[model samples]
Target: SHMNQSSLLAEFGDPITRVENALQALREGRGVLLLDDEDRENEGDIIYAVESLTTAQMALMIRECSGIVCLCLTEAQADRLALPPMVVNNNSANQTAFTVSIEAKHGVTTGVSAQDRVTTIKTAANPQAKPEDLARPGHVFPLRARAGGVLARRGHTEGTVDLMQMAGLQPAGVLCELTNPDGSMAKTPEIIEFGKLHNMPVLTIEDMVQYRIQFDL
Candidate 1:
């Protein structure tokens, strides 16, 4: 049990260093691999700051990550933007909170295109964005991040928001699960290899937890 922990840190760098690297990657407008515990989902998500969202980056999420590309927002942001949960009662195992899907009212056509989705995410993440700024039931799904972040919950939604905020950017992020070329979920080893191949940091949720506690975030 302990050997697995030591080996992961040994190969990928220590938890603190890995988390710091992830913050740097996000600040550089690059995506980072955020992985959870093996006993949990055992999945990795590609997380990018919404402030730096671009068509090319959006395309990377759609093509490289076969899973749904979701925009993660802080609970405060969701409340400020008047975005409510997609469903009233949450029954999912992780209790991941999803809000109404949206599209930018100004520059989006079909809302499904990568360029349009990027616009939608950036608009939603804007500090001054209001309810009227977005069209309801659109393409990009928005998720609410827990206020306590990774320290409170180890889900990708909270982790993405925490990492983005830690990087001194907007507390909003675009996230998608990394899927194998064969359409299967990417395991830890594959996720780590993918991060190396893509020149991004791969950090676990426990890494974020440790960093947050040490730094008092």
Candidate 2:
């Protein structure tokens, strides 16, 4: 019998709990954290549960966690925002493209620590000097897509709106755990008006917390 998972699926037969189902839930921005560990705090990566974010919510994101009120993009959106292509290191004797370097005046191969490598990348790519010019934010990174793709420091409403539009199946959100204390804010009326009114559904951990009573997931 289907008693083990005797539940309706997408309004169909009983929604059996399968790994695929759980994966699908995440893809849809609706999943739960199995907080079975009594000794640990928990979080889940949900997608598309929120369409808008208040500065308050934004604050919590940066202060409490290292999550990006983030999204993927469509080609049109990517082009509209003028997002630069991603960079790749053809590290070799003749590496000359999309590569960032950090060497001293001597021009010899100086020590390029992990920190230096990250810093160099930020200096070269970060489209907008978000938070601070040449700050080299972690939000800016390269993607090996369509000649390349970039997820730069794009936190503006217009940029986010485009990300919302980039949803492939449903508008999904990433319920990231707090990893840093630097959630940046636009704090502009233009952003406020454009943002406070949009239904983009970029959710946070709180959504899953509340889901305990409302949704089975």
Candidate 3:
């Protein structure tokens, strides 16, 4: 019977549990390792809600993931923050919706330190934060999540936003690709190992899709 149940069946049986675990992690200020589709980037990213983000967590992500640390914001939030796309005429394969990098104007020094980056991330998510509240071309890069979230796009950017929204937190999340010690992107094996090593929940685009379908999200 177990052999009859394929990996696809296993995932389909209870995707809700996987998504719920990720949401619990996020709500507790814990990071979740999110994986993309094999046909896509085939990479995993460490994701956490910016509202619950801390300096230590940011530092850990920098040391472990060692990739571009991008903040994920909903389209409305990005509009409110006045974060324009880095490339107006985006012709990239995925059209990632990258916005101008920013740093908080008030508290950060160089905005490169983990502490300063946390401040920038939190400030960017603040409801009252205006465009002028941030300094452009700084440290933290912002990515705009589609309004429909993972249902609309299978990108890590949308996946993080979907998880954050499900967790009842701000729809703002921080994501960075999980990289190997050899400076290459981490695949499923490395991604799973990292999640186990850190005791963090691991999620995927498929998990998000199934969970949303079940809950009508």
Candidate 4:
């Protein structure tokens, strides 16, 4: 069900008008509008446009909407918007996997440092592969050994293959869990990659809930 580029373009009009209408709908108590403007013509326009929603306007829409999910904003844009911190998973586990701070947890309960945990996981996973062999994006060596079954269950091909060329590796059969520094869930690529590698179909928060909003509504 992947729409071609032309079909996608035909689905939405000009980016500016699309953004404006989306914000207006959100303010009018419809639902949250998720915009991806990585190459927006006027970046400032996005912030100003979103800020135009009055407190009352936001509250009205918020009351009507279960929640809002936005994506692809830079750290600076996030700061400018003053939006809540969000986490995203980019690894292939789709679970909240991280290096725990063992130094901080010393003398506590035997918690290990995040670095140590990662090293340990890496070592345990690939005892034969050199550390250098495991240093690439979408590298399948570690997961192939430790979590090979998991990856297989997720429908990912074993051995070496170019992910971009393989449609099978897109989003389906992939799962990811995103978290912020404090461990709270936020929009993140790490969690997304994890999911992607594990066979859980990854999608933006908006796409996850698009069914709630009727296209004509």
Candidate 5:
């Protein structure tokens, strides 16, 4: 990534929300450059898009942004917007970090740190399962179903793994389906009605957990 503080601030806002911020900076009297990490194979149409701009429009905008400079990642995208590259640095660090720290409590390590084990488990298992094999029937555990939580009577492949990942607990090896409030099998219509009653989406258990994680819940 470009290391200059000003370029970083311009391309990615103080906290990169979206691309619009950089565009606005261009509208003002600031120099603007665009950068995309997309591959060269995708640059053809992007360059054509920029070349279609009229010189008058470009000059007008350039006059408005007299002092600031903008830099973008790809030459194609810059050409598409009738802009030029301010500076280019291809030595960007694109690695992701997966840190797992173990804490010693009372002079004893808490059995292989949860973060390490969970990451390993997810990486190892998810790839081996087929998409169809990963599909699971959704169920709801009543608050009063059991002491800890509503437990699955029998386990499906992904369902079992997902439950363990979320709650850090395994399901009971039984496959008891959920029932409606009226003691009927919880069908799709019943699930929809239940969701309406609670003002929530009728999502699968896996989807629900994923939503929670996305929202930082």
Candidate 6:
């Protein structure tokens, strides 16, 4: 049965503590496992943090896991990077995802040059990046999109809305194929336990995709 926001959060203990730990790990270039989109199309996506990954961290993630790894971004962030917000389905598909490459141009040119742009991206994801380090860059860019293009979604809505926003500093995202081979609720326990140990709140893709996270947050 579909439970309301209050009911869902009830399943967790110490919400504030959970958010603090999750954000702490996010700032460290570490990961917090989320059972993204449970019981929905494209469910079973084990996701990590994209806005916070350095090349080394992402490479490590790719090496450690067996499933496919894709870069995720908020719609606003996508446009700022000048990468086309690739659409997966109908125009309003609240949740969207795409792959990125420093070597390729997917859409209109963004303000930053290819070389410098990639650097900014890496730095944006790197918590270790300093203000002076950023100021030294030849250019700075913002996330933008023209007209009515679709943006990548952070997650669904509902009780978990507050949780995602809690780590909103680490907003944007990264999706992984960490589920069992068949992908039917496989490896969920490990993810849940993983979050439990790391202090991240375990959430399903549905939570973010369906806008169940809610706006009152």
Which candidate number would show the highest TM-score if scored against the true structure?
1
Which parts of model 2 have CA positions greater than 4 angstroms off? 1-43, 46-51, 67-69, 89-217
Q: What are the Cα lDDT values of the candidates?
A: 0.88, 0.28, 0.85, 0.25, 0.24, 0.42
Task: Tell me the lDDT of model 3 at 85.
Answer: 95
Where does candidate 1 stray beyond 4 Å?
A: 1-6
What local lDDT score does residue 40 receive in model 4, on the 0 to 100 scale?
23
Clashing residue pairs for model 3 = none
CA displacement after TM-score superposition, residue 50 of candidate 2 (Å): 7.4
Give the TM-score comparing model 4 with the true structure, all chains together.
0.20
Q: Roughly what TM-score does model 5 have, to 2 decimal places?
A: 0.18
Q: What are the candidates' C-alpha RMSDs?
A: 1.9, 15.7, 3.0, 19.0, 28.5, 9.2
**CA lDDT of 205 in candidate 1?**
95
Ranking by lDDT: 1, 3, 6, 2, 4, 5
lDDT of 2 by residue, 41-119 (tens): 3222222223332234444444443443333333342343344443444663322121121222221223233333224
Question: Candidate 5's residue-wise lDDT over 1-217, tens digit each?
Answer: 5354233333233322222332232233222222211231110000001112233323332332221111111222112222222223324242111112112222223323333222222221232322232111111110101122113211122222222223322221111233444544444444334334533222233232333346343
Where model 3 places Cα greater than 4 Å from the true spot, the runs are: 1-14
Q: Kindly report which residue stretches of model 4 are placed more than 4 angstroms away from their true locations once superposed.
A: 1-48, 68-72, 79-217
Off by over 4 Å in 6: 1-20, 41-56, 64-67, 85-95, 99-165, 168-171, 180-185, 193-201, 205-217
Model 3: lowest-lDDT 10 consecutive positions: 4-13
Q: List model 6 lDDT by residue over 56-139, tens digit each.
A: 544433443443444443444444444543333535454333323322222214524433344455554444433333332133
In terms of lDDT, which candidate is stronger, 1 or 2?
Answer: 1
lDDT of each residue in 1-217, candidate 1, tens digit only: 4357437645778999999989998999898999897788988999998888889888988888964789899888899889999889989898889898888999879988899999988889998989899989898989999888888888999999999889999889999999988899887777888888899899999889999899994
lDDT of 3 by residue, 1-217 (tens): 3332125324323567778888888888899988788789978899988887888889988898874689999888899999989988999999998999999999889999999999999999997889999999999999999889888899999998889888999989999999888888887666777888887877778888998888884
* TM-score of candidate 1 to 2 decimals: 0.95
Residue 49 error for model 1, in Å?
A: 0.8
Q: Please give the lDDT score for candidate 5.
A: 0.24
Whole-model lDDT, candidate 6? Answer: 0.42
